[PDB]
Amino acid sequence: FAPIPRITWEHREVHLVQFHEPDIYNYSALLLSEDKDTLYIGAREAVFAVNALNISEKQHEVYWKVSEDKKAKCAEKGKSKQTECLNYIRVLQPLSATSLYVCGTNAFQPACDHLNLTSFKFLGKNEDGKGRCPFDPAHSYTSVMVDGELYSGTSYNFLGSEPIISRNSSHSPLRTEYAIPWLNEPSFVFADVIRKSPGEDDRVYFFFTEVSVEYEFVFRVLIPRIARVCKGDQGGLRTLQKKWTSFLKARLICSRPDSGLVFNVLRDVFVLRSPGLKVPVFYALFTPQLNNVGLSAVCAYNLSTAEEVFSHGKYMQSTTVEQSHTKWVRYNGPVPKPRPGACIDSEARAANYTSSLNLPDKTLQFVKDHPLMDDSVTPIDNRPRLIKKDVNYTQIVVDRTQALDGTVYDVMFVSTDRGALHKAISLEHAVHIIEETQLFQDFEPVQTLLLSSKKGNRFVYAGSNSGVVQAPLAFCGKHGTCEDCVLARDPYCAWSPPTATCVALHQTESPSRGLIQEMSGDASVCPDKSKGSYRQHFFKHGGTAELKCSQKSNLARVFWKFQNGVLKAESPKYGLMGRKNLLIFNLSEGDSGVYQCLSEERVKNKTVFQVVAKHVLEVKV
Amino acid sequence: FAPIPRITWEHREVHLVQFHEPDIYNYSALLLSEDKDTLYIGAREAVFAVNALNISEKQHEVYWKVSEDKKAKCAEKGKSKQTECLNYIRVLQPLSATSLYVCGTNAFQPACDHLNLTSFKFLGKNEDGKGRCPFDPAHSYTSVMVDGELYSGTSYNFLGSEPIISRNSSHSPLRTEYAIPWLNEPSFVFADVIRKSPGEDDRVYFFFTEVSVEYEFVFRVLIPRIARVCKGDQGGLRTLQKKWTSFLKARLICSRPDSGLVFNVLRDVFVLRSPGLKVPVFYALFTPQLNNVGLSAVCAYNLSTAEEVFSHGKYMQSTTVEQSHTKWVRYNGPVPKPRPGACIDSEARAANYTSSLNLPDKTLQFVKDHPLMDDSVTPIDNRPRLIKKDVNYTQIVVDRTQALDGTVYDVMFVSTDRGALHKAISLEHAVHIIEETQLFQDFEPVQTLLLSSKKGNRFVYAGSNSGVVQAPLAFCGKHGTCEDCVLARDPYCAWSPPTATCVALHQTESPSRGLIQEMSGDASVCPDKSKGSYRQHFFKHGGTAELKCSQKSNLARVFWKFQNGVLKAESPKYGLMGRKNLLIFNLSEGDSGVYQCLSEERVKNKTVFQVVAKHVLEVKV
């Protein structure tokens, strides 16, 4: 299991910009403008536009509240008139340069509109949102705007049942079959397009947790799924009419068998796209369904691993489906030539199959009956990237950054259900949790996370029920000396001797080749050896002394030394107010002397020692 | 989840009698004399007889070490000569008033002998213990002597690859089939007889955890089982020759579906009989196989619940789905003439079947292929009696006692893998862990737990690798005041006004109707509440004094009061020395007076206060 965060920043010690609007709650949707200078925030009954560099600066705001009349009809349906019968923004996507596509629960009457960015006024289309936005604010949903087409995953009705993954377009509107083999009580998590290159079609991936049809246990077992459809899908001609002919799904496994750890509940997914790396990586956040005392895990998957399963793996087959009971097993028979679930490609095309509409019924009937793959999509290295006890993580974003020495790091930012944010990097041999910051002082769970993209200073935006918080990717300035800046082992921070400050790389002006940084934690490379704080004390004989000492690291052991020896602070001679401060009770002349508060922190190969504080004590009389 | 132990007794504050022999280890088998007040202990290479009233007092001792010859012959087999190639006693059972049946691993060469109690010397019978005793001291095992016949559950061979439950009698020795459907890599936990009326046969029940064949998951899932055979079984004539004809098993479930908690690994079972109980109760201890960060649970089962399943439940059926892959489903077909797996009772006698040897082959073939029941044996109330976090419980014994007001409590004594004992009860829809005692100072896991049968002063004996410990059912004498005594909410303890002491309700000569006990924890009625701890303080001016405050409640919030009003141990004038003690810095004079230390505790719906310490100090000017 990962260690505890090395440093804990109280909301206080650090600078965090916050945004919220009196009497407006549930800031669950965030979207950066195309120019990246503005951040759009979808909340309950409102949408705001704020400076992406300082979200406390509100630029625009618009409301879309439910009429008292409509709120009346909604309460009649037996819903909370003060919580449920409101318009919770659920879709907030880019439509064009001048507008956004916005959908809200509209008091259990899903509706969509266009937000004119120029006037920042809703156009008032009030389109039906059934199928693209849920009815209930508690229901799960996901969606992704792909070439002007909204691909959605959510519940089709008021009860939250009738799960549906559909693309509603003017031309080819497709959807999933209302059948357990396709979707079995799924909880939607994420959806994104994997296009890149190339005549290769683009695929839209959907991620969710659903009840497994292939696993049996004491009670219903949940299982995470990675699924995808082809953007160019057109539905079948006689079969799968107006339904996907490319829908395939597979298990997404995050576990540690030797430990009997199984994280079968998917919480979030992030697609890491790197200009320098040819294949995107899916970072996924899981929690266990069984005996969850508070465990969380992060697994990373190579897209090519997922692609090989859908393109070359075996399908599962429902052998016997009735009272003898439906059993799902590996299908060993022959597979229809145009591979079921495949996107129309060179071969398919080089055989007259130009669109899904002319695919053979054999191929179409097969896919309609075998949407589940037999193989599991496994993580990179076949193990989780991070497993953490005593924390319920809710979201994850990953930033690829280069340390001073060129080494590239995939820094994971994961929030918690208590409003905090952990920053971690895998440091080959273990996971290093650089720090944790309390984003929300009310301890509201973090519901959504978003990395800033503008060229320049980088930030993370976190949304919760009480507001949005903007945080920098690092607090380098918080480290007052080279040893500390170096011991943080934070790829974003380096020491700048000329300025005598721990600086944030890439964006900094400091001595490029003169900056210091050691991802090994070997502060021995620093120029000076800070000797901590120095202070003289003059106390009244008999009285009691209290010597202050404290440091930021949670992984360092601090102790006192006096006259070349380690002080044993117990009683009634000593105290220890704050498990750091030394207390000396019967102040007699024997207590006169030099007291040192040292710290020992085991880093990579070597352990580092530091003088935190030095006190010269003189008891008078 | 249950709370933490309310009171914590150090190994030294309470008095525990201990027994151990120099150089003798692994005290895993305990047996109480049928008549005499003697406790027989089987360790590695030895068997002792000690005073059950004071186990540290040895009465007899006989040894059975393996010669250096076989020691090497065994070490020649790839086993460790100084630890594995020794004679671990595994069976210690009563044979007759003057004899004990004893079996030991005997350097990977199971052997059984008689122990003449009179002379307390072995008869050198050297019977082959293959099947009745394991080869490896690390292999699971269990057994019970029934009418002079040993029913054993363990491994049949050197490697422990072949599991077996058998009765190797002189006339009708029976064993289980060496087949997956019967036993699938089981780990044996417990075995006991359930005597039956008038005519009905006695059943011998077996408890073990095995790899489930009916469940399919990410990886192999374990499942606890309760199984039984009929004592009168004689095997089949032309089918199941020399094999049980009454072997049936079923899943033993301990879970709380509401929070996704499932404890599928069985650790121990205890049968609660008590004269005021027409039907025994099975208390079982479980831990989870999945995501186990240290979770334990106790579930109680009604014997009649299991009987219903075995006599009226549907069987499961193996189905060779596809090819080479078998799945287990519920069987709905017709069930053979006399019920497969039933004992020879009335319906069979009435059909002229007087022995398993007369059962129709159709019935015998069915039971051979259908040993698994389709229904689960579920706990009383369908939920655990206790679920505890951060603890790994190893053994359990239960004592049914009656409080002073007549209320009956099933007190659960559960040991931990760190050598401690917890005493817990079900109190007003919640679990109350009365206390925790460190039985073994070496923190050795408690391997076996035994509860002595009511005979005035009762005890619990715990055996570990390092020795055997004896503890009373309560430490009533450790509660100094009536308030302490009542607050403990221990059904064994009551306050004796006449003697001004907390006494064991059932061993005191103090008039019972005068005794004070309130399981609600309300100590209002207690006499002389001006507790006890009272201190006088002569303190110099400008000095610094620590005011000691002691209370045993791990659940209490203690605070201080000053001249009527509740003080705030807040700097710069105060400071509590690590939760408890109040320090008064710079002994001024307005600081002179009486200091009260109150302990606040929630005892039901009520919040109560107890003056834990009274301090009267005057700083001399």
Curated annotation (Swiss-Prot), chains A, B:
Extracellular topology ranges: 1-621
Covalent S-S links between cysteines: 74-85, 103-112, 230-343, 254-299, 476-493, 482-526, 485-502, 549-597
Tissue-by-tissue expression: Strongly expressed in skeletal muscle, peripheral blood lymphocytes, spleen, and thymus and also expressed at lower levels in testes, brain, kidney, small intestine, prostate, heart, placenta, lung and pancreas, but not in colon and liver.
Annotated Sema domain residues: 1-473
Subcellular location: Cell membrane
Coiled-coil residues: none
Record keywords: Cell membrane, Developmental protein, Differentiation, Disulfide bond, Glycoprotein, Immunoglobulin domain, Membrane, Neurogenesis, Phosphoprotein, Receptor, Signal, Transmembrane, Transmembrane helix
Family indicated by similarity: Belongs to the semaphorin family.
Protein name: Semaphorin-4D
Provenance organism: Homo sapiens (Human)
